[PDB]
Design a protein around this ligand. Structure first.
Ligand SMILES: [Mg+2]
Ligand SMILES: [Mg+2]
Ligand SMILES: [Mg+2]
Ligand SMILES: [Mg+2]
Ligand SMILES: [Mg+2]
Ligand SMILES: [Mg+2]
Ligand SMILES: [Mg+2]
Ligand SMILES: [Mg+2]
Ligand SMILES: [Mg+2]
Ligand SMILES: [Mg+2]
Ligand SMILES: [Mg+2]
Ligand SMILES: [Mg+2]
Ligand SMILES: [Mg+2]
Ligand SMILES: [Mg+2]
Ligand SMILES: [Mg+2]
Ligand SMILES: [Mg+2]
Ligand SMILES: [Mg+2]
Ligand SMILES: [Mg+2]
Ligand SMILES: [Mg+2]
Ligand SMILES: [Mg+2]
Ligand SMILES: [Mg+2]
Ligand SMILES: [Mg+2]
Ligand SMILES: [Mg+2]
Ligand SMILES: [Mg+2]
Ligand SMILES: [Mg+2]
Ligand SMILES: [Mg+2]
Ligand SMILES: [Mg+2]
Ligand SMILES: [Mg+2]
Ligand SMILES: [Mg+2]
Ligand SMILES: [Mg+2]
Ligand SMILES: [Mg+2]
Ligand SMILES: [Mg+2]
Ligand SMILES: [Mg+2]
Ligand SMILES: [Mg+2]
Ligand SMILES: [Mg+2]
Lengths: 206, 122, 244, 240, 98, 75
RNA sequence: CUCGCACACGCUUACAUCAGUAACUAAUAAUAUACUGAUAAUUAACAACCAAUAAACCAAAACAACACUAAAACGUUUAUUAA
RNA sequence: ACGAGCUACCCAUGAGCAGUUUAAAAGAACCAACUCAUCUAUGUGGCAAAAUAGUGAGAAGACUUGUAGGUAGAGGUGAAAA
RNA sequence: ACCAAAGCUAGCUCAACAUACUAAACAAAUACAAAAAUACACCAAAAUAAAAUAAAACAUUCACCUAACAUUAAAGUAUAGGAGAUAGAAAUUUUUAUCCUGACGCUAUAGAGAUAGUACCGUAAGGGAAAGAUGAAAGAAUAAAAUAAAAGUAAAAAAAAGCAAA
């Protein structure tokens, strides 16, 4: 299932259907539109899970790993570099667990760094002779591998145990289709031995 | 006044307004005013035997998927009739006039489950 | 904004695009051409230039056709190209008097007319103008075959002309099955209006009738893709056999 | 909307048929006649005004019927009578002195000698005496009795010449018809119908007569005792 | 057939354009009704020996009523077109020569 | 079939299953698949309204592109 | 002090359980059938949809015995077909 | 173009009138339900854009009333009050 | 000190080009009382524009008034007009292909009515709105800074006498 959003919607690093986002922007609000630089999917070279460097901010020159990207506002966020401190445990007469949350950053402020020399580079998309599209650095002239990142589900295929209601891999990949010219209905009738002799009468369509 | 945006269902009218909710009919009206239900009009669920079925509603998570290749008429023909046509043409017995032996149905009015008129619901 | 094409050309563009373009060229040009109908309710003047009696100067003068309203029942008969004149008039024939809405109507008569080619009597509503036109044309068949669409102004007349043309072009023996000599004599005197069959079945058709006829002619069941695939496979097999 | 007439009954029946009144309104729904509506419910008793209607063509001669009962009809001023002959019964218009168990003769024969004119009998105009009181006069042969029907009203035969009968209507007008037209003899029943006194304004509403409009209209030139001459003889014979 | 003439003058249009008609151009005067004129006389070639008119083979002038209702519907006469006249002329020639 | 209803629109009329032919159907016979001459005017209004909507959408998109180019002069 | 129970027509959940009412509804509070949220609900025997084609059939309802006039809605049977 | 769900009048289909006096279901009489609205007093941004209280007229009829249909503005309908 | 005040965006407007013009959705149900799978039919209809106005009245007349021929001139000319108000041509002439298209148009009482033909108002045809403002981050509300500037109040009720001021 998917949620619908008004055209005048502002993205705030929160899930659109989440309670925090709902309380931040009620369904009856329409805020001023922020200018977002148009960057296409074929030109968005900032992925999730790769090491990047910070250009401007309090942590100038520091490097961190990207943990999330928001294409709507051209935002990229790194874990624990550009941080402001906030209290998460709030009660009537008790406080604590003051954690550093981190603010989002723009593509003009975050640029990819190659793992060879660990120095900032500019990334340009190139088409390899093998039929693959891999990012190629221009300052040094080297390819940057795709930063594989775990999915939000939290399960890795290397360690998975089948439950009572999961098919085995061999059963799932077993091929038993015989491509003949019979419908599913006819094949099921033949398989189960259901015999029907009489046929439908003339039916007019108009 | 009365509403106009609300749906005009059978709850919003007089006693004489008894509108169906979308269920298919299952018979007619007999002689003394009762309802005579026709057995053939009632759907019969063709439910198979799942006792020895070794498949589950979910697949293994490590099982690989495949590239999306939707089945087309060309692929179906290549799979079901092309080898037979090629073998018969090599043998020299191929008859262009008669194709009913290869699964081709010149007229759908004969068989039970027709394709274009769609005589079957599902 | 503005339309790219003026609203006047919308009908012509619709006739140019779609199934209307698949209609026969002779039919398309016959409907495209717009001949001026003969003057019936107004008297035309001869010369293009006339001397103004008050000015004593030569001035250009032209003919403005008077709008004539044809009621729907005029299409079931032969009115001779005349109909209802809807206009105004001055009481006492004085300009300074009142202006009065006026409707001038033709005198309709129920007469039976004989067709020599079709060998049938038609009970149709006609006018003295229609009878006079028949007399001048020297025959009902001659009148129908000579007077064009713009002068007939009758769908029934167009249907009669289409039937006569079809019979003449097909040389139908249905006219006189037991009188071949009479049939030949009848057919020979109308030899000036012989039309080829490719165009004799599209003369008395309206736009909707022509579109329906074209759709019926072009109506074909979609051949199964099994036939196409079998033909393609046979072609490939023949090519492979011939290349070895 | 447009209403449909209640008179859709192609089969003749003796039992009264229910009728839907319409007070002055035409089929469109607008008033055409004023002062009609809001009466009593009535059932229509179908009347066979073609008195000489033989049951079967195999016996087209004169036939005799028996009167079963003379009854009241709300749809007309006169009383009706039920006459049975053979296998069918019919409603006819009762004469002045019809009673149950009477015998009526229906004929179409003309002879050189005039027939003794009974009261319930129906003979062609050419067979009746020259001074006979008649009713249910028929204009064209085989057409039906459109003329005299009201209670007590009767016409008077005047003279028969050239195979053609002349009658005098209750409006004192002379009517010329073919001598073969069938006409019933005698005065119509309910001869005291003109002497009935409506007791109150409510009986008119019972009969179905709405009150006249209260608008006062000044009389024009139409009013006044117009002493006009009797209109000429109304002839129905077709002279070649 | 009624023949009417506009009371007002219509402005010229010489390039092939349709004249700009106004409401005042719907006012007509009935110049003449053709039904009231003395109607012409119909000439017909006889094809049969008729009692009143004459013998077959003559061009006779009869009124339109009888010409359209008696002579033509019953085949007793035909029109006086040149094509029909030539056949009668040649028939007369052969009758004279034989 | 591609039909034209009384509102002037072109619809895809699906066919229903009946026991009698089309010319004998009480309910189907009173349907109307054609447009009367008074519907062309409303069809023209529909065309013009859709044209206006599309034109102003195009103008809005052009203005948005120009504003973005002005706001981000990376050229 | 006494306009109550149900059905028809009409409104469509405003009905029921729990919880909250600083404020929003009650022309004010208490709290709640009238506001808020969550969860549930009206189960057919009553009511709606529920034969045509010809024929025998004049004879009112008003305790209907029998009548009056204003002439009066309301039905069976027979025969042919009714999955 | 839209309006007879109010109202004016008709057309179908139904329903009401208890008690008393009278050979009476008599467009009779007393008086309920019910239908109207004579007079007065409150009310006058009112309970109410026509009401409340008292008092009145009819109450087996030219009566009241439910449902549904019809008559549409150069018109409808009208026991004429434009 | 309350009430409050200020954002710059949503989007609109006018033209050019333009494929050549009733968008997307149309699984099932939708002109039975629309969204109700299923029974022997009937279907279709045309007949001038009028008037408000001008002629200082109003009767003949009254440009545009949902019908193509555009432009430069002939020309407001010939003509038509209660010859009044006004209406008004034609014969004959000129018009070189494409890009160079955006804005001395508006910024939430403006610009489309529009956040929307939605709420709401009418039985219906129909009419028809107002309402947004923090921040790079609110996954920075023991939240931070700018005005504390309208009318209306409070801080702070008034002391003979008077168009309230000079
Ligand atoms: Mg409403
Ligand atoms: Mg209901
Ligand atoms: Mg109900
Ligand atoms: Mg049952
Ligand atoms: Mg009567
Ligand atoms: Mg009577
Ligand atoms: Mg009177
Ligand atoms: Mg009077
Ligand atoms: Mg309500
Ligand atoms: Mg609640
Ligand atoms: Mg409160
Ligand atoms: Mg109504
Ligand atoms: Mg009503
Ligand atoms: Mg009583
Ligand atoms: Mg009384
Ligand atoms: Mg009172
Ligand atoms: Mg008192
Ligand atoms: Mg009282
Ligand atoms: Mg009283
Ligand atoms: Mg009294
Ligand atoms: Mg007037
Ligand atoms: Mg009137
Ligand atoms: Mg008066
Ligand atoms: Mg007065
Ligand atoms: Mg004026
Ligand atoms: Mg003035
Ligand atoms: Mg005046
Ligand atoms: Mg004036
Ligand atoms: Mg005008
Ligand atoms: Mg003059
Ligand atoms: Mg003057
Ligand atoms: Mg010119
Ligand atoms: Mg606005
Ligand atoms: Mg202030
Ligand atoms: Mg002082």
């Amino acid at each position: 299932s998917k949620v619908t959003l008004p055209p005048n919607y502002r993205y705030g690093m929160s899930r659109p259907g989440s309670l925090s986002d709902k309380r931040k922007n009620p369904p009856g609000t329409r805020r001023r539109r922020v200018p977002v630089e148009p960057i296409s999917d074929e030109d968005w070279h900032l992925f999730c899970g790769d090491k990047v460097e910070i250009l401007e901010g309090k942590d100038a020159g520091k490097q961190g790993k990207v943990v999330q990207v928001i294409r709507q506002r051209n935002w990229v966020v790194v874990e624990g570099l550009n941080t402001h401190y906030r209290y998460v445990g709030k009660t009537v007469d008790y406080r604590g667990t003051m954690i550093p949350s981190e603010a989002p950053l723009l593509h003009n402020q975050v640029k990819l760094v190659d793992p060879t020399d660990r120095k900032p580079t500019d990334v340009e998309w190139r088409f390899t002779e093998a039929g693959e599209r891999v990012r190629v650095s221009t300052r040094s002239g080297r390819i940057i591998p795709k930063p594989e990142f775990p999915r939000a589900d939290g399960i890795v295929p290397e360690t998975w145990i089948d439950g009572p209601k999961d098919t085995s891999v061999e059963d799932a990949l077993e091929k038993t289709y015989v491509p003949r010219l019979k419908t599913l209905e006819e094949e099921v009738m033949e398989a189960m031995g259901i015999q029907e002799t009489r046929r439908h009468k003339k039916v007019y369509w108009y | 006044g009365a509403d106009r945006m609300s749906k005009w269902t059978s709850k919003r009218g007089p006693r004489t307004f008894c509108k169906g909710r979308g269920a298919k009919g299952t018979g007619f009206h007999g002689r003394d005013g009762k309802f005579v239900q026709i057995k053939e009009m009632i759907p019969e669920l063709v439910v198979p035997e799942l006792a020895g079925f070794k498949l589950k509603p979910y697949v293994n998570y490590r099982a690989p998927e495949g590239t999306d290749t939707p089945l087309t008429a060309k692929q179906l023909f290549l799979e079901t009739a092309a080898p037979a046509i090629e073998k018969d043409f090599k043998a020299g017995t191929f008859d262009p006039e008669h194709l009913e032996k290869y699964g081709f149905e010149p007229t759908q009015e004969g068989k039970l489950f027709q394709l274009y008129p769609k005589n079957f619901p599902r | 904004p503005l339309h790219k094409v003026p609203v006047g050309l919308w009908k012509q563009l619709r006739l140019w695009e779609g199934i209307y373009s698949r209609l026969p060229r002779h039919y398309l040009r016959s409907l495209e051409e717009a001949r001026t109908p003969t003057p019936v309710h107004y008297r035309p003047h001869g010369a293009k230039f006339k001397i103004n009696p008050k000015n004593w100067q030569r001035e250009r003068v032209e003919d403005v056709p008077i709008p004539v309203h044809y009621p729907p029942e005029s299409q079931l008969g032969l009115w001779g190209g005349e109909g209802w004149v809807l206009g105004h008039r001055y009481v006492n024939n004085d300009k300074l008097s009142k202006r009065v809405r006026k409707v001038w109507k033709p005198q309709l008569f129920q007469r039976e007319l004989y067709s020599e080619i079709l060998d049938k009597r038609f009970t149709v509503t006609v006018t003295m103008r229609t009878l006079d036109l028949i007399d001048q044309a020297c025959g009902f068949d001659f009148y129908i075959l000579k007077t064009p669409k713009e002068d007939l102004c009758s769908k029934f007349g167009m249907d009669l002309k289409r039937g006569m043309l079809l019979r003449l072009a097909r040389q139908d023996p249905q006219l006189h099955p037991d009188d071949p000599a009479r049939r030949a004599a009848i057919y020979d005197r109308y030899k000036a209006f012989v039309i080829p069959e490719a165009e004799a079945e599209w003369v008395g058709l309206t736009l909707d009738e022509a579109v329906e006829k074209q759709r019926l002619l072009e109506e074909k069941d979609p051949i199964p893709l099994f036939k196409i695939f079998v033909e393609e496979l046979l072609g490939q097999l023949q090519q492979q056999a011939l290349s070895e | 909307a447009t209403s449909v007439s209640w008179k859709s009954r192609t089969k003749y029946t003796v039992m009264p048929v229910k009728m839907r009144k319409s007070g002055g309104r035409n089929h469109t729904g607008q008033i055409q006649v004023h002062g009609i509506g809001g009466g009593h419910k009535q059932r229509y008793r179908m009347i066979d005004f073609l008195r000489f209607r033989p049951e079967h063509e195999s016996k087209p001669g004169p036939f005799e019927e028996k009167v079963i009962a003379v009854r009241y009809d709300p749809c007309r001023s006169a009383d009706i009578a039920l006459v049975a002959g053979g296998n069918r019964k019919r409603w006819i218009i009762a004469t002045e002195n019809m009673k149950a168990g009477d015998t009526v003769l229906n004929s179409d024969h003309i002879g050189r000698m005039a027939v003794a004119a009974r009261e319930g009998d129906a003979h062609p105009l050419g067979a009746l005496p020259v001074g006979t009181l008649i009713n249910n006069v028929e204009s064209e042969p085989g057409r039906g009795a459109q003329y005299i029907r009201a209670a007590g009203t009767c016409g008077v035969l005047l003279r028969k010449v050239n195979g053609t009968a002349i009658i005098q209507l209750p409006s004192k007008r002379q009517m010329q018809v073919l001598e073969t037209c069938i006409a019933t003899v005698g005065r119509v029943s309910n001869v005291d119908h003109n002497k009935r006194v409506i007791g109150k304004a409510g009986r008119n509403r019972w009969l179905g007569k709405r009150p006249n409009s209260g608008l006062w209209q000044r009389k024009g030139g139409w009013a006044g005792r117009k002493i006009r001459p009797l209109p000429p003889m109304k002839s129905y014979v077709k002279l070649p | 057939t009624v023949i009417v003439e506009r009371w007002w003058k219509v402005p010229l249009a010489g390039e092939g354009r349709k004249p700009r008609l106004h409401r005042r151009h719907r006012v007509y005067k009935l110049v003449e009704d053709t039904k009231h004129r003395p109607k012409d006389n119909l000439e017909l070639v006889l094809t049969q020996s008729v009692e009143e008119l004459g013998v077959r083979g003559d061009l006779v002038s009869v009124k339109k009523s009888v010409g359209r209702n008696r002579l033509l519907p019953q085949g007793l006469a035909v029109y006086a077109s040149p094509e029909n006249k030539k056949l009668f002329e040649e028939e007369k020639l052969l009758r004279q020569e034989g | 079939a591609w039909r034209r209803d009384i509102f002037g629109r072109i619809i895809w009329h699906k066919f229903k299953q009946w026991p009698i032919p089309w010319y004998l159907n009480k309910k189907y016979n009173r349907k109307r698949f054609f447009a009367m001459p008074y519907v062309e005017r409303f069809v023209r209004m529909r065309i013009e309204k859709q044209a206006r909507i599309k034109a102003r959408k195009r103008s809005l998109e052009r203005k948005k592109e120009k504003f973005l180019q002005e706001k981000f002069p990376h050229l």
